[PDB]
Symmetry: D2
Subunit: 327 residues, 4 copies
Amino acid sequence: NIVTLTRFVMEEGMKARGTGEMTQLLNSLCTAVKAISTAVRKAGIAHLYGIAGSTNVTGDQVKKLDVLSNDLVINVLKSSFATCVLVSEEDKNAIIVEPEKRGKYVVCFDPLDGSSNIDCLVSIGTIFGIYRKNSTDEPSEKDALQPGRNLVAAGYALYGSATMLVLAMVNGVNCFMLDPAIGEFILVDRDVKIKKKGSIYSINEGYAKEFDPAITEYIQRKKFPPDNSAPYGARYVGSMVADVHRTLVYGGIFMYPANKKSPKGKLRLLYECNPMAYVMEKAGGLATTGKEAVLDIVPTDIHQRAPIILGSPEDVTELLEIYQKHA
Amino acid sequence: NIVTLTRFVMEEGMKARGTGEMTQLLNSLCTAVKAISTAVRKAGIAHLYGIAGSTNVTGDQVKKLDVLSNDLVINVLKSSFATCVLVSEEDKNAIIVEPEKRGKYVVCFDPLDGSSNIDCLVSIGTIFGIYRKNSTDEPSEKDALQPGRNLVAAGYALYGSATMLVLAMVNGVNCFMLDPAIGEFILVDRDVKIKKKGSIYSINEGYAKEFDPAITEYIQRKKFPPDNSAPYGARYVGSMVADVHRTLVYGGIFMYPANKKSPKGKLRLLYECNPMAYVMEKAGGLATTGKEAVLDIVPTDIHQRAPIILGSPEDVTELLEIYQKHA
Amino acid sequence: NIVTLTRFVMEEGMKARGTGEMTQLLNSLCTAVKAISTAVRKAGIAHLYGIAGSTNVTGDQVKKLDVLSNDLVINVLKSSFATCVLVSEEDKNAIIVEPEKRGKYVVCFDPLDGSSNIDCLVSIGTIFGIYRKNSTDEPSEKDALQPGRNLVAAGYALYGSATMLVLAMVNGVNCFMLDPAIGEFILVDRDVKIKKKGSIYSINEGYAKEFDPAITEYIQRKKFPPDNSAPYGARYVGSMVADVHRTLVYGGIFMYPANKKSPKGKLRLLYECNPMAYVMEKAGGLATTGKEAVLDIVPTDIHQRAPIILGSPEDVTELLEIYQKHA
Amino acid sequence: NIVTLTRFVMEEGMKARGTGEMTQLLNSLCTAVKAISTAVRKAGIAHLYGIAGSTNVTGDQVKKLDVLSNDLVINVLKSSFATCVLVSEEDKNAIIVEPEKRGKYVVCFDPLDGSSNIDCLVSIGTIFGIYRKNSTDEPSEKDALQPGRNLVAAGYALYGSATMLVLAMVNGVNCFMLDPAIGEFILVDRDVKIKKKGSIYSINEGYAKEFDPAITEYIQRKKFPPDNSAPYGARYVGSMVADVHRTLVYGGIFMYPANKKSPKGKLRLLYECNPMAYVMEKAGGLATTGKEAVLDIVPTDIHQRAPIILGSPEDVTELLEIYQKHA
Ligand SMILES: Nc1ncnc2c1ncn2[C@@H]1O[C@H](COP(=O)(O)O)[C@@H](O)[C@H]1O
Ligand SMILES: Nc1ncnc2c1ncn2[C@@H]1O[C@H](COP(=O)(O)O)[C@@H](O)[C@H]1O
Ligand SMILES: Nc1ncnc2c1ncn2[C@@H]1O[C@H](COP(=O)(O)O)[C@@H](O)[C@H]1O
Ligand SMILES: Nc1ncnc2c1ncn2[C@@H]1O[C@H](COP(=O)(O)O)[C@@H](O)[C@H]1O
Ligand SMILES: O=P(O)(O)OC[C@H]1O[C@](O)(CO)[C@@H](O)[C@@H]1O
Ligand SMILES: O=P(O)(O)OC[C@H]1O[C@](O)(CO)[C@@H](O)[C@@H]1O
Ligand SMILES: O=P(O)(O)OC[C@H]1O[C@](O)(CO)[C@@H](O)[C@@H]1O
Ligand SMILES: O=P(O)(O)OC[C@H]1O[C@](O)(CO)[C@@H](O)[C@@H]1O
Ligand SMILES: [Mg+2]
Ligand SMILES: [Mg+2]
Ligand SMILES: [Mg+2]
Ligand SMILES: [Mg+2]
Ligand SMILES: [Mg+2]
Ligand SMILES: [Mg+2]
Ligand SMILES: [Mg+2]
Ligand SMILES: [Mg+2]
């Protein structure tokens, strides 16, 4: 049979005996992601350039792809009636949902990732993490500060050569490809497992001068293998979603470690590291700061950063072992 | 006003007093590229996964994007009545158009570029160069062997977050955005010039062990600038058309130099290097093998390879100076 | 808030305490209807006309819009795991669903209605009726022979100037408009109520010579009102879905009564009359053969026909009263 | 081969040795019509119903399809640099193009026709006629007053189940299907001829009480053919472009004769009757007021009305004979 994202989530909610709130949430996400894909692919851009004159906004307003993404996600999530607290990359403070629209889930998200790659048309995406509320207190920032291990669902949307949504939950990672002709996400890879060992490494080598000793040592070894085999190939798109996705599907390792300008690391823990690290773990892969598991860090700031190394298990441990050795 | 690719092409043909055969040719090229863009974004993919039943072709029974792209290009172009010789990365021999469909142009193209990036949904593209057939004798493969200096037009379509067609001719380089809701390319950026000096470097460092010393030295300055300025950032998508286009839009440098497994460079002279050098040049940048201008190479095989270094003029110039210095 | 069809059905299944089987069914229908809309609007027709040559089917096969509709519906319904018996306009015998895919619902449908209007591009649609299985016996034709009053859900999809799906269930009729850019049905009219009295009548007057006395009398009166007011306007598209939809939204009356060639009437009772008559009743309108209510006819043949008059209550009763008088 | 509207238009312009200004004009017209088609099908309608929030414009604050259509037409056409005078159903006065944008053509159009059918989702269309400006004096409204006999081109886009553009010029009538997945019109039916005699009649019979006796007699023969052949079928969509196009494709007759509330007929000479008569004539059919050819009327007001009878030659001829007979 053919499986659509919409039938998959519903069949998994039925199996789980869920009241449906989460199903409704995911169905929301799936609508938000299409809305975002269409905007990213520039449908309707002729109207910006005056195809029908300029009568159309008497108001002075037109939205950055960034702002619009954020609007779509917030409104679409709020509409699902399934969330109490949202955390966006774009808001300094957690968003507490009005009581009349309040459900039991906490969503951390990057509405659009890969922003240095927007104006040059390289791939970008959306990264999301879902938790259930613990407390019985009035929902607050506190509810979003959970460690990754606690995620109920996570994944991302990539807008590349085509659009793909990847969803991880307790029983695995599935990839669904968007068919833009009918607006339906089609299950295309089931229960995805990352290769033990890859042949690609992905890091911004422009910080070479600022890497700690173990990265430097590891990078060296990718380029001059001591066993004299073939060097890993390099790839670094510049968009976390794209490098992470290539990593899942081809294997290899992706790195964003601490440097001079970011000594805690660049990437955000709540709506960048955590979700990607959850996906990576359901698929049999690893995600470490180099010192601890990423999913085990208990955050204290919704916008806190962390270094991350993620990918194939043999490659990431190879790197961990360099760290262990150096210490 | 609003300027669609169709009106631009037509008006430029009218100004140059063309007979209309080149216009017809770029019009075809514009249609080819929309049909590839839709296949790339996976429209109607639901039919492959049995939405309307008859599941019967599954696994790898049916036609890869690469092949479909090639077909669209060959068939759309023959239909313009403007070509006599086509050379495609995907065909071992030049294609000679039937007399009843012969026009005066030669076209070299890479129907779909960045094939290592297809399965992982990274940006992919189509590259093209157009030549005016000089000889009066029977059209043939040697017709496709002109130096890049001779191009009448070259450019590319990037299938990225959004689809863009970049077209260069004697009077400059223009960027057209594809609005997929109306099937129209919209002129978005006009008479583009690349900046004098960028701060991004693009290369596959996996090959670090194979690099010549100029290349090696140059990477060093990028990471450890002797004068202690900010180090360059690295970006390498793995798709030529994506790396090149970022390089045009953002400035900086792109390299695929010679290595051991590729003593002549990996990239193809006729349908990757030439068009890209032409675009880069008409934009105010440089394209060199390290020793000579790409566009002046005298091609002897239609699938010949070359080393290619391109982008911001000061960046390429600094690298040429390292070459000269290293005898 | 904005309501999508997908969120609406799910919110109504939650309210109803349904296990979800029906929700899954409707979500299926909604996917089938998009798939159908895209095909009807001719996306991809360039491939039929050879945009990429003719390499693409080595097989001799291409589908009528009619056959393809039917494939989409059957397969999509079967996939919902929610149906046991389907009745199609296109199959002489009821379709009994395999046990491993069997649920509790019976669906009668016209995959595409308005076929004399296909080749001239006039509006066409899809008409569906859903029943719950009564028996505990092995599902058979018998399960589909229920009177209309027994419907659980009904509606239709119109593909006109835009695409609209109309859905009626116990608590009303709602219209959702398809937004083809994101593939989502958007609630656009809520709890729809037909006007008491309209000013349009819709019948094929070419059979004038074969109408019974009451129609003739009623038509006369629409054209020469005895109270000397303004005559009704005439409209007859030729597609039941379109004339029925105009009827719901503008008011008026639609007629397909018995004639020489069809003395039982043309339209099918199970997947034409019944569904339209259910919609018409939830909206406060009437549907009569002229002698009995349409929804109260207990069918004995899955393909049985019946005359129908439907529409605004004052207009349809006005017609009934002529019948009553003549008898 | 495959023939797109863009290549047809270009090739016909090349064969006729045009300067390219008319080509540019039909190219614009082709783009106008795709942009209307997408607005008509409701793409991005999700934004109007607050999907990305900011619900603030609701009810009837924002721009009706009719207005958007008009704007697209005026702006796309001025941008072609090929027009000097435009007349639109939606503008009280002719529009005179600015000198810097003046070309030599005059265009009369009905940006969106079948407005009674908009809210009910029935087929709607755009009608156009193009004239060559004869006078050397300042361009003005009288420039738009040529008889239909003078048209260089006329035709229509039908927004139906699928979108089709029908274009007629001196050398015949051609049907192009719009493939909305690539934004290309595909030549689908070439050099169309309407059949000699059809079996469908199209009229609003609601006006039966106002009809002249020729019309009245003619309807009678249609329902009660004196020679006892099969009676004609009736079809009346309520959108001129839909009724007319069915009439071209299927044969038969279309009438909007004079009535009491419309002593001169309702339909407009310049942008409904003229173009349609021209298409019908170039197809081998007839277009008459009942007494004279539509195309020979000498228009005195740009919004003048006329009675119109068109379609299969033998059908119109029979009706003219009834006119003649009734003195
Ligand atoms: N659609 C679904 N897919 C996977 N798990 C679900 C789904 N719905 C509910 N569950 C599981 O059931 C729990 C409670 O469900 P709910 O009653 O929908 O809030 C969730 O937190 C999930 O672990
Ligand atoms: N659409 C166009 N845009 C720019 N230059 C053109 C165009 N068409 C023709 N030309 C120039 O005029 C030459 C002859 O045109 P053609 O007769 O179409 O081959 C070409 O080689 C171009 O240099
Ligand atoms: N999505 C829904 N919308 C409206 N009614 C529903 C829905 N789901 C279930 N119901 C009602 O519940 C009955 C049994 O539901 P189910 O358990 O889904 O087969 C149906 O036959 C409906 O009357
Ligand atoms: N694309 C075209 N298709 C058919 N005829 C054309 C075309 N372009 C020009 N012509 C004919 O040539 C005349 C002058 O062309 P132009 O110089 O473009 O105004 C027009 O009035 C048409 O009769
Ligand atoms: O240019 P840099 O410092 O490598 O940063 C790249 C990272 O920045 C981000 O845009 C921050 O979100 C990531 O998507 C990406 O991996
Ligand atoms: O993996 P490598 O050796 O860097 O090759 C990448 C290059 O290869 C190509 O795919 C050759 O087509 C280019 O698109 C790209 O720049
Ligand atoms: O031409 P006739 O006899 O009026 O039949 C029209 C009817 O035929 C049908 O196509 C039969 O399904 C209906 O959609 C439509 O109302
Ligand atoms: O309702 P009436 O009087 O038949 O008018 C229908 C005619 O009116 C128009 O809408 C006038 O634009 C035509 O499209 C159509 O043929
Ligand atoms: Mg962001
Ligand atoms: Mg981010
Ligand atoms: Mg290629
Ligand atoms: Mg290539
Ligand atoms: Mg049917
Ligand atoms: Mg039918
Ligand atoms: Mg109009
Ligand atoms: Mg009109």
